[PDB]
Curated annotation (Swiss-Prot), chain B:
It is found in: Apical cell membrane; Melanosome; Cytoplasm; Cytoplasmic vesicle, Secretory vesicle, Synaptic vesicle membrane. Disruption phenotype: Morpholino knockdown in the whole cochlea, especially in hair cells and spiral ganglion neurons causes a dose-dependent hearing loss. GO terms for molecular function: ATP binding; proton-transporting ATPase activity, rotational mechanism. It comes from Mus musculus (Mouse). Kidney; found in early distal nephron, encompassing thick ascending limbs and distal convoluted tubules and in the alpha-intercalated cells of the cortical collecting ducts (at protein level). Expressed in epididymal clear cells (at protein level). Mainly expressed in the organ of Corti and spiral ganglion neurons, in both the early postnatal cochlea (P2) and the adult cochlea (P30). InterPro entries: ATP-synt_VA_C (IPR055190), ATPase_a/bsu_AS (IPR020003), ATPase_F1/V1/A1_a/bsu_N (IPR004100), ATPase_F1/V1/A1_a/bsu_nucl-bd (IPR000194), ATPase_V1-cplx_bsu (IPR005723), P-loop_NTPase (IPR027417), V-ATPase_su_B/beta (IPR022879). It holds the Pfam family ATP-synt_ab. Non-catalytic subunit of the V1 complex of vacuolar(H+)-ATPase (V-ATPase), a multisubunit enzyme composed of a peripheral complex (V1) that hydrolyzes ATP and a membrane integral complex (V0) that translocates protons. V-ATPase is responsible for acidifying and maintaining the pH of intracellular compartments and in some cell types, is targeted to the plasma membrane, where it is responsible for acidifying the extracellular environment. This is V-type proton ATPase subunit B, brain isoform. Keywords: ATP-binding, Cell membrane, Cytoplasm, Cytoplasmic vesicle, Hydrogen ion transport, Ion transport, Membrane, Nucleotide-binding, Synapse, Transport.
UniProtKB/Swiss-Prot annotation, chain C:
The chain holds residues 207 to 412 of 617 of the full protein. This is V-type proton ATPase catalytic subunit A. V-ATPase is a heteromultimeric enzyme made up of two complexes: the ATP-hydrolytic V1 complex and the proton translocation V0 complex. The V1 complex consists of three catalytic AB heterodimers that form a heterohexamer, three peripheral stalks each consisting of EG heterodimers, one central rotor including subunits D and F, and the regulatory subunits C and H. The proton translocation complex V0 consists of the proton transport subunit a, a ring of proteolipid subunits c9c'', rotary subunit d, subunits e and f, and the accessory subunits ATP6AP1/Ac45 and ATP6AP2/PRR. The gene is Atp6v1a. ATP binds at G44, A45, F46, G47, C48, G49, K50, T51. Catalytic subunit of the V1 complex of vacuolar(H+)-ATPase (V-ATPase), a multisubunit enzyme composed of a peripheral complex (V1) that hydrolyzes ATP and a membrane integral complex (V0) that translocates protons. V-ATPase is responsible for acidifying and maintaining the pH of intracellular compartments and in some cell types, is targeted to the plasma membrane, where it is responsible for acidifying the extracellular environment. It comes from Mus musculus. It is found in: Cytoplasm; Cytoplasm, Cytosol; Cytoplasmic vesicle, Secretory vesicle; Cytoplasmic vesicle, Clathrin-coated vesicle membrane. Phosphorylation at Ser-178 by AMPK down-regulates its enzyme activity. Belongs to the ATPase alpha/beta chains family. The modification Phosphoserine is found at S178.
UniProtKB/Swiss-Prot annotation, chain D:
It is found in: Membrane; Cytoplasmic vesicle, Clathrin-coated vesicle membrane; Cytoplasm, Cytoskeleton, Microtubule organizing center, Centrosome; Cell projection, Cilium. The chain holds residues 150 to 198 of 247 of the full protein. It comes from the Eukaryota. The lineage of its organism: Eukaryota, Metazoa, Chordata, Craniata, Vertebrata. This is V-type proton ATPase subunit D. It comes from Mus musculus (Mouse). Belongs to the V-ATPase D subunit family.
Amino acid sequence: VCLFLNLANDPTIERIITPRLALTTAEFLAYQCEKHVLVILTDMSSYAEALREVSAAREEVPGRRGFPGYMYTDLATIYERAGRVEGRNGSITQIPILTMPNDDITHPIPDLTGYITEGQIYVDRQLHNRQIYPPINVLPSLSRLMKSAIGEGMTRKDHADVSNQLYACYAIGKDVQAMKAVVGEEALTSDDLLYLEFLQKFEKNFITQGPYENRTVYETLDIGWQLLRIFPKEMLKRIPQSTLSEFYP
Amino acid sequence: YLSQPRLTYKTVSGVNGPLVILDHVKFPRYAEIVHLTLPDGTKRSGQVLEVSGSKAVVQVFEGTSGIDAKKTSCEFTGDILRTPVSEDMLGRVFNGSGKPIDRGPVVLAEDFLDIMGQPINPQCRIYPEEMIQTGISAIDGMNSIARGQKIPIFSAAGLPHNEIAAQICRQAGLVKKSYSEENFAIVFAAMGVNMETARFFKSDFEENGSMDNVCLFLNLANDPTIERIITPRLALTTAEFLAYQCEKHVLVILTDMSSYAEALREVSAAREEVPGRRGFPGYMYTDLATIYERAGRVEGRNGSITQIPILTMPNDDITHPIPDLTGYITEGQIYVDRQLHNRQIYPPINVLPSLSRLMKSAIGEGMTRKDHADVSNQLYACYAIGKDVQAMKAVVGEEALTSDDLLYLEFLQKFEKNFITQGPYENRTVYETLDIGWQLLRIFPKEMLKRIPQSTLSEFYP
Amino acid sequence: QVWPVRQVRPVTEKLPANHPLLTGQRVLDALFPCVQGGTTAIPGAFGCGKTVISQSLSKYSNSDVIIYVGCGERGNEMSEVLRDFPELTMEVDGKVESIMKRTALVANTSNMPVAAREASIYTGITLSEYFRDMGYHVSMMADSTSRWAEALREISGRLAEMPADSGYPAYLGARLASFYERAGRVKCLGNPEREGSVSIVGAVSP
Amino acid sequence: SLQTSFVTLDEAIKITNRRVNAIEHVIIPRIERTLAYIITELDEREREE
């Protein structure tokens, strides 16, 4: 572990150079030494604040919410140092951490971060109020590289289908919960009961997790199938017939 | 003092809007006053606004029409604006620039005071204790005003705030506990007002005989704007002198401060400053601080000042900068409700949203009467609940109503009919207001008055 | 000696918050305990018992030194604090000690020059740090961060800087972070080894 | 008499509860979200000016 530190007491303008230096070090170890380096950044929002301040000092063109007009380009420059290269076995992975000012998503920082990166992992305070140690709202948490790392050879053929089915079922669970909130318990139907049951068991088992556990992928898939078995065979419309004819029972 | 002769300039670099640029100026001072001679001989005056090098800048109050480049001339008094002051200005009406609009002469200068003034020593501040009778039932009973509490009166256009101000001027005075009213005066200053409703102030003040203890100022809407900037500071200086150099309590009233804000925007535009929020200057807050907080009690003295400005709401925008800032710098507030004005209630003062910060100490056993706080709390609760009961009867229908709620409705309607209504020419001492409040309270049994301790009920309710 | 106000007095080391902070109030002590050297925030709406908390901290508290600071309270309330708090007293091994030989004050009304209101906060922090270096547990209370914030906005609007959301400047977040982090428990510099702490209790008036 | 009053009263009260839930969980959040969006747009426009 090679560390770089900057407390909030340190000079403001230093933050613009702080991350590039660490990334250069990582790039050295990744390409001139073919190591697998993982990289973590704490607060991109602080970097954005330093940048808006510098730009405002110079009176440059403003865009959305008093930002520099060209903040997109710089965020691209920082974020684009990633991915492996031909002929060398090194690798660079980035898991930067950024803080929305509030629950809003249309704030420019998270928006442009979504534009550049190929996905995102969302964290919702609602789950934190319910004391679920991973407060991961799976719904807004789309990732784009589930294509080429999933299927036969890697994990199993049924992984993508079960994930899609779980998406659909969790979504209907949210919708029926909304309907419950307005109409009342007694106006619902059996399907609504099944969906509510699925929602409860899913949040109870799939998401809720230990701080120090270590779940294997296959265990996760087994949990998913257990959750799927709650619904009847016929309600599973996101799964091909060929897969449920083998894995449903 | 100025022992040197004055200067006379003939150089006029140019003219640009309401400003005048001069050159070859020897040691110009920032805020010194100047006079101007025209080709036809007409006289004018202005203030120095911007100075750099030998160049100088002068804004002209009377408006820059007809000024030439060779025939006009300038004069330098070499001193910032100073004003005369004296006790005898009572009974006199001015136009704000020091010129008496009344037929009387120029007042003599017992002393000269700097118009800007200087701030208070925070250590010397003293918490207000006494209070000022206002002659309005709502203001005295629902709320109260200590000798040093600064409260604004929010209103809107088309509401009779000028009339509340006039009544306050006619009725103002200290409560006789059983060292006279000679220790009480008022300084009424109206800014940027219509010709009508201004002569009204003059006539209403003159008929009743209030001239004995009022110094009045009028600034018309069509007057120069810099006069509008100057005037309230002038009046505050006069009140300051009369209240601190001479042992006297004073109650200053200011009307239509939004016009003062507009003139502040005017001068800001003149000096080429970038507007902040909603176009208002960014330094409005500091200015409004300077105008306010020139009142209270101080160590080693006995005089006091109490400040009551009037604000106009721009279409009920409670987040508009003007009312918001004035709220952040003042204690409590009073509202004027338009629905009451539609209901033809001469005082349209509302009850539920108003609040006085220092009421807890402005009254007490040492003041008019012990009961008052409990009475106010109980009737506040009663009025709120009665409004809620009217909202109930709006939907549920009277047939499903109880006797207690009927009494609450009676309390509401009689309160509106009698207590809040005052009349343009009716006077009520605080004791009468308390008595009427007890008359209202008497409708309920002694037990229904939860808020009041049993003691007060035992003495007074019978 | 002279010390710049915008700088930070160097320290030997920073330590975790270890020893608890107690107060006579049962609720704050048992249910939501504070720690020595910690950071706390309290609402400042009219009618709430902010006076209760301030006085209880001033009188019952482990802290050797206490610093109350102001940022503008509309004047009359400033008279109220300046009158009431010098009069207070506490039992010190049976003595009255009503002089308040453990407090100091900074007072700014609503018309002092803008930078005085803006910089009173840093003045208070500097005084607190100076007393902290004497190996003592000090506590600080700010009347209102909101007033410091609007003072900062005022000086910015003067400087005609580019206004951010809600018209406030870009300094705001960084300034507040730097302000609040300045506290914490600290091993001091000096041959006569020693340890002190410094705690902050700001207020907020939405 | 009591019986028929009971049943009709039950149905009416359920209707009113439906209306209260409808206004409470749907209408208000939509309007306030709209309001926040308007405020944001106006502030941005003033900034550009």
